[PDB]
Design an enzyme around this catalytic site. Sequence first.
Site, short mmCIF file in Angstrom:
data_model
loop_
_atom_site.label_atom_id
_atom_site.label_comp_id
_atom_site.label_asym_id
_atom_site.label_seq_id
_atom_site.Cartn_x
_atom_site.Cartn_y
_atom_site.Cartn_z
N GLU A 71 0.82 -1.21 0.00
CA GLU A 71 0.00 0.00 0.00
C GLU A 71 0.86 1.27 0.00
O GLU A 71 0.56 2.21 -0.73
CB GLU A 71 -0.94 0.02 1.21
CG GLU A 71 -1.82 1.26 1.26
CD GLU A 71 -2.57 1.40 2.56
OE1 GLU A 71 -1.94 1.22 3.62
OE2 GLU A 71 -3.79 1.70 2.53
N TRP A 79 -8.32 -2.46 0.02
CA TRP A 79 -9.03 -1.36 -0.64
C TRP A 79 -10.20 -1.82 -1.52
O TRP A 79 -10.96 -1.00 -2.05
CB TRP A 79 -8.06 -0.54 -1.50
CG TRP A 79 -7.27 0.49 -0.72
CD1 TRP A 79 -6.01 0.35 -0.22
CD2 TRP A 79 -7.70 1.81 -0.37
NE1 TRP A 79 -5.63 1.51 0.44
CE2 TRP A 79 -6.65 2.42 0.36
CE3 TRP A 79 -8.88 2.54 -0.59
CZ2 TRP A 79 -6.74 3.72 0.86
CZ3 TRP A 79 -8.97 3.84 -0.08
CH2 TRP A 79 -7.90 4.41 0.63
N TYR A 135 -5.41 9.25 -1.20
CA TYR A 135 -4.02 9.46 -0.80
C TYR A 135 -2.97 9.64 -1.90
O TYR A 135 -2.41 10.73 -2.04
CB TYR A 135 -3.58 8.31 0.11
CG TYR A 135 -4.46 8.15 1.33
CD1 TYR A 135 -4.44 9.09 2.37
CD2 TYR A 135 -5.31 7.05 1.46
CE1 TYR A 135 -5.23 8.93 3.50
CE2 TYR A 135 -6.11 6.88 2.58
CZ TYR A 135 -6.06 7.82 3.60
OH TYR A 135 -6.82 7.61 4.73
N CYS A 179 -8.25 9.28 6.34
CA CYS A 179 -8.26 9.09 7.79
C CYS A 179 -6.92 9.65 8.29
O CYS A 179 -6.87 10.44 9.21
CB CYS A 179 -8.44 7.62 8.14
SG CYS A 179 -10.04 7.01 7.57
N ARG A 218 -7.43 12.03 11.73
CA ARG A 218 -8.73 12.58 12.11
C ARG A 218 -9.69 11.58 12.74
O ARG A 218 -10.51 11.94 13.58
CB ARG A 218 -9.41 13.19 10.89
CG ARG A 218 -9.93 12.13 9.94
CD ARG A 218 -10.89 12.69 8.92
NE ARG A 218 -11.28 11.67 7.96
CZ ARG A 218 -12.31 10.83 8.12
NH1 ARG A 218 -13.09 10.92 9.19
NH2 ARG A 218 -12.57 9.93 7.18
N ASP A 237 -9.79 3.81 14.45
CA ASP A 237 -10.36 2.59 15.01
C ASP A 237 -9.14 2.01 15.72
O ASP A 237 -8.28 1.38 15.09
CB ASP A 237 -10.80 1.65 13.89
CG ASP A 237 -11.26 0.30 14.41
OD1 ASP A 237 -10.83 -0.09 15.51
OD2 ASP A 237 -12.03 -0.38 13.70
#
Lengths: 264, 264
Positions: free
Chosen positions: B58, B80, B94, B146, B166, B169
């Site tokens: 990633e 994804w 991103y 995120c 921001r 989990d």
Amino acid sequence: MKQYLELMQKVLDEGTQKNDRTGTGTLSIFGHQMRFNLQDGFPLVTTKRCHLRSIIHELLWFLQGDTNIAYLHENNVTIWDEWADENGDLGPVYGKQWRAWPTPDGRHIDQITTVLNQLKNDPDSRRIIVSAWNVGELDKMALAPCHAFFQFYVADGKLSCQLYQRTCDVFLGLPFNIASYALLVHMMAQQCDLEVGDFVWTGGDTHLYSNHMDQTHLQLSREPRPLPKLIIKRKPESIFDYRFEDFEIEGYDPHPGIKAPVAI
Amino acid sequence: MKQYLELMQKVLDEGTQKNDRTGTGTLSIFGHQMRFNLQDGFPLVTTKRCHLRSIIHELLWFLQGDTNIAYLHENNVTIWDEWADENGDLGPVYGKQWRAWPTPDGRHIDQITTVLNQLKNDPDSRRIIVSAWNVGELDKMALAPCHAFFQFYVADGKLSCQLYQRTCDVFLGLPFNIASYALLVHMMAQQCDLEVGDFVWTGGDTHLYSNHMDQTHLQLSREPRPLPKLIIKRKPESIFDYRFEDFEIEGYDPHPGIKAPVAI
């Protein structure tokens, strides 16, 4: 304030000696965070006399979205003069991004309005954010955003807000920043019929200039005093209708002011 | 890891009961920060078995700037898939923002390259930043960022980086995030002939899902073990020439894996 003083001491004890925009040297640390429960009082530094006049005008100015210093000048607010051009323009700084972030498809995004819409319709949203960091607009700004991004949060009827300040002059600038955002939280909370929660301040390059060391030691020898109380005399119909006279500070009993000399 | 476990416990002890995108309930806190001295070992959680395979792919994918999951698929990386459309597109997420943030005047800003240029020519810069938070592009993204913004810092020959996440989990996502950025710091440091410093993680809405409580208690009963060591077998000519096989983890001795059930 306790949290503010602890940061000063941390920079003193753990900061690394270096420099800035190649001017005055600094002691710096990277990454820090502190919390101010707004229910315990308005976070206006008491270990040195501070004023909110300029802060208030600047915030209302930001909210209005116009980046020309005319309004500030009309009111004798000069903190942006240094960066303003002949026409009093500063380029697309804070206000412009807050109220009209330009998109390539020709729109002007009103982030402040968006946030209020979210606090009203989806308070648990995890992306109630306002960013001044518009990468394609940096070069046009007189100054790249220092307080560049902030996020809101709601829990148990209280509005909290965290600020990411990429760069921070602990002695001179920070007092201004905390008060400014603390004020915004109060205003937003009022508009949303919510109580005020926490103001979480996060910094990146957090430093003290070498020519502020004596000032810092002086301030560190002073005991913080009870935080003052913010009073909002009126309840405007929207976040854009506040006026300078709407704000009042009660119980502010600070130690004497300390000048901040700056090299040029 | 000590810091990770302390966060879990904090969410447990101080988190407030609410909900998310209106699915599973959560316990949440707003605003947190922790630091990982990368010199003490690669921050890969040991209280539960984690893998770096997907993470590595990633990251390289992000660095390449292409937001189509083809490369990820070609390599059996499926994290994804959930968000990808029929054509395998995710919109301007991103990668797109990192390598080609679109401006209204028609340019594509290469933030990664910009950062490297800064680390090389002006390491003391206070705005060595990469932001994925492109306000005018959010709606087109399959998912709003995120881990939305990060800043680098250099002191005493070491490269540090702070991340603003921001939304987080804690149980399922966080382990991934810390490792990902820790890896990026190692790569950047190598490209810049610098030692690795601290990875400062800052979160906004930090939560634990109610259906992860048993898992969290289980993990909290496990003693963290020594952090593993990252090995970079090769020294590429640029930040864009790394390959999966260049990374190796030594001394990773984790407790058993723990499944993360998720509602749909």
